[PDB]
RNA sequence: CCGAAGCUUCGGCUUCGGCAGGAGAGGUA
DNA sequence: GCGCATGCTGCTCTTCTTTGCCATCACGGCGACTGCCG
DNA sequence: CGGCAGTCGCCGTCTACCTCTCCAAGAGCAGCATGCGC
């Protein structure tokens, strides 16, 4: 149930989000994937009297998704329309590696 | 970040591999972020903290074994008390013997577990002791373990930035006279490799 | 086959009771394949007269 | 191929000067290396 | 480099205007 | 009369490689290499 | 350690000339403009 990472194209982080979210319910796996968060920051685009606060994704192309490691979970997650593939080539690239929990908590500071 | 010229690494033969004395598969693994390598290992401090950490690791292993003993103690005691308050008096002593067999199987499981942890610590010690430059260390777990316990002395990383360090700390002359000594008095196929 | 892969992947992301055959079908791959065969191909050749 | 190299270098610079975790930086560095390799010699390693 | 237009002392001077890579198929000696 | 919502429309990229897609490719010469048997 | 034989990748495969066709598009992210509601 650790926090893993995934890779999307570019600008498809929220499409990937919605897709995965709904799929988990339609495909029927509300017991492996639990939480999805896309890290995002802020950009002050004031037009001298008109604020904006537009999406400024700190890590463009990377969506961290908590997932219990299995096999069909890997299938549904990686085959969601939009994701390029998993991360974690530390061991050649066979299985993803769980992101250091402390690093996850520091990423979730905001 | 530094990169590597394709001409001097993916050739026939590999000129970088011939200069650094590394197999092409090892170079491919290091360059493309799939394994670690030890850039340098301090041999002075290590040669003293050798005995120092020998003592330390003996202590650690003792602690580990004693914790095993204690868990064994607790669990065994409780189980035996339970099975003693009732030696399956409704049928025969054999049902209690069978649950005692189950308990002993559990015992042996925990035994194997702790023993394997012991030999993995042994592996740790081995790897950390006899460690020389240019020694591919696969498995991220092992690397992080070593960098947690004995994070000093040895250094290393992966990527082309870790090959720049190996090339920078390289002495051509010593290797040249070493190869000439090998060619002078040698036979077999090591002479062909030296040539 | 390409259109079938698209519809299979999209059948699990839409909401039921609003799914109709016209919203599940994409024509673009088929017309693209046909126009790629009848144009830049090595077997559909310019006729000599 | 130049645009690919420049894009990967810019993404790597922005990610390094932000405090990113090590796994993501390693992935980006590997991808930059592959892009440069494809610039100098396309098809020698992997797929064209 | 070419064209158009002016000054031109006949050496020339000035204004404006203008571009050309790959893949596949068939054929002749 | 003013605020909010939804459609013309500038406007600048974007296009991977798994449990998938993909299907193969002669023929000879040469040299490393690499697991494998002793 | 020490031979050992299959194997796997990389190199090369004649000259000059003529004619024709075809060479990423949909999705997405804003940026408003006008219609509709209270």
Curated annotation (Swiss-Prot), chain A:
GO cellular component, as recorded: cytosol
Superkingdom of the source species: Bacteria
Alphabetical keyword list: Transcription, Transcription antitermination, Transcription regulation, Transcription termination
Biological process, per Gene Ontology: DNA-templated transcription termination; regulation of DNA-templated transcription elongation; transcription antitermination; transcription elongation-coupled chromatin remodeling
Keyword Transcription: yes
Keyword Transcription: yes
Stated role: Participates in transcription elongation, termination and antitermination. Stimulates RNA polymerase pausing at U107 and U144 in the trp leader. NusG-stimulated pausing is sequence specific. Does not affect trp leader termination.
Family indicated by similarity: Belongs to the NusG family.
Protein name: Transcription termination/antitermination protein NusG
Highest classification ranks of the organism: Bacteria, Bacillati, Bacillota, Bacilli, Bacillales
Covered residues, full protein: 3 to 112 of 177
Curated annotation (Swiss-Prot), chain B:
N-terminal signal peptide: none
Swiss-Prot/TrEMBL induction comment: 6-fold repressed by starvation.
Annotated function: DNA-dependent RNA polymerase catalyzes the transcription of DNA into RNA using the four ribonucleoside triphosphates as substrates.
Assembly: The RNAP catalytic core consists of 2 alpha, 1 beta, 1 beta' and 1 omega subunit. When a sigma factor is associated with the core the holoenzyme is formed, which can initiate transcription.
Family under the similarity heading: Belongs to the RNA polymerase beta' chain family.
Name this polypeptide is given: DNA-directed RNA polymerase subunit beta'
Originating organism: Mycobacterium tuberculosis (strain ATCC 25618 / H37Rv)
Range of the intact protein held here: 99 to 293 of 1316
From Swiss-Prot, chain C:
Impact reported for residue 30 to A: In strain: vr1; rifampicin-resistant
Effect on the protein upon substituting residue 48 to V: In strain: vr3; rifampicin-resistant
Effect listed in the UniProt record for changing residue 45 to L: In strain: vr4; rifampicin-resistant
Annotated signal peptide: none
Effect of residue 44 to T: In strain: vr3; rifampicin-resistant
Function field: DNA-dependent RNA polymerase catalyzes the transcription of DNA into RNA using the four ribonucleoside triphosphates as substrates.
Assembly: The RNAP catalytic core consists of 2 alpha, 1 beta, 1 beta' and 1 omega subunit. When a sigma factor is associated with the core the holoenzyme is formed, which can initiate transcription. Interacts with CarD, TRCF (Mfd) and RbpA.
Protein family membership: Belongs to the RNA polymerase beta chain family.
Protein name: DNA-directed RNA polymerase subunit beta
Annotated source species: Mycobacterium tuberculosis (strain ATCC 25618 / H37Rv)
Organismal lineage: Bacteria, Bacillati, Actinomycetota, Actinomycetes, Mycobacteriales
Gene: rpoB
